[PDB]
């Protein structure tokens, strides 16, 4: 058992409380869009990757974003925080550019 136990202190007690512990170790995975059909190219690295942490030891429970609000379902896979959208306004001044370290 590695779930937080639900405890009965003695007969008469009734509180039964669980818990879980989480860290995100990254996973970055390119959702790609061009800059000549929308103005703006996009590398969108999807949403880190969960991991449960018991006494400092992490084990990668896969793309977090979907579980954890805020999220937006781009390509049906919800991308959340721990991401980046890099924004390329390409035009005849060369290329203007801005960035959201999400």
């Amino acid at each position: 058992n590695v779930l937080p136990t639900l405890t009965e202190l003695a007969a008469g007690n009734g509180t039964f409380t669980g818990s879980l512990q989480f860290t995100i170790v990254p996973n970055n995975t390119v959702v790609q869009i061009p800059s000549s059909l929308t103005k703006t190219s996009f590398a969108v690295y999807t949403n880190g990757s969960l991991a449960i942490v018991l006494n400092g030891k992490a084990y990668s429970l896969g793309p977090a974003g979907l579980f954890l609000l805020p999220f937006v379902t781009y390509t049906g896979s919800a991308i959340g925080a721990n991401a980046t959208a890099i924004i390329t306004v390409s035009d005849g001044v060369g290329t203007s550019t801005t960035q959201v370290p999400i």
Binding site: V31, I33, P34, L37, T38, F42, V72, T73, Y74, T75, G76
Partner: protein, 188 residues
């Protein structure tokens, strides 16, 4: 793929080429409970195909839309704009320009002499004898590259018979015939 306006366009995408009896597909990443009222704007500014399709409760969809070539107002050339007026929960209006041209086939007559020199000087008439009758759509003066190539409309699944008459001054006039069934090079 390009994520036009947040809905992931998988199809249509701007610039798509189509032929006789080929299919427009609708697959886009919508937000659930979305319809797409889909408008094929012909090059005369008219929606020859309006139809309302339903996305599924997940975000996705693979739908067949319109069969181009197999319906009237698609049987001859020219450029359409399929506007997805995605009239869902999310209004996305994308002008997605698309092209079309019918199928076309080259059928070939050849003349030769065993002197080791190909013969020339032929008036070579290819006839559309698919009608049941010799409907002349292209006559050629035979070229010096020894292919008598003539372009004519074609369609999938029909034994398109063609009569090739060779009438030439200096040698014997002769008549052969072929049949292309679908697209093929018919050379004799």
């Amino acid at each position: 793929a390009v994520t036009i306006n947040g809905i992931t366009f998988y199809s249509p995408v701007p610039n798509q080429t189509y032929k006789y009896g080929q299919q427009l597909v609708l697959s886009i990443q919508s937000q659930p409970n979305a319809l797409v009222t889909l408008y094929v704007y012909d090059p005369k500014g008219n929606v020859v195909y309006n139809n309302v399709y339903q996305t599924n409760s997940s975000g996705g969809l693979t739908a067949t839309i319109a069969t181009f070539g197999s319906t009237p107002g698609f049987t001859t050339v020219g450029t359409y704009t399929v506007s997805l007026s995605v009239q869902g929960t999310t209004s996305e209006s994308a002008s997605v320009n698309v092209q079309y041209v019918p199928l076309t086939s080259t059928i070939t007559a050849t003349v030769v002499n065993q002197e080791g020199s190909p013969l020339a000087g032929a008036t070579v008439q290819l006839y559309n004898t698919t009608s049941g009758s010799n409907t002349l759509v292209a006559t050629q003066t035979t070229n010096s590259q020894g292919v008598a190539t003539f372009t004519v409309l074609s369609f999938p699944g029909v034994t398109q018979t063609f009569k090739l008459v060779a009438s030439l001054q200096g040698y014997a006039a002769s008549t052969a015939s072929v049949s292309i069934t679908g697209q093929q090079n018919a050379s004799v």
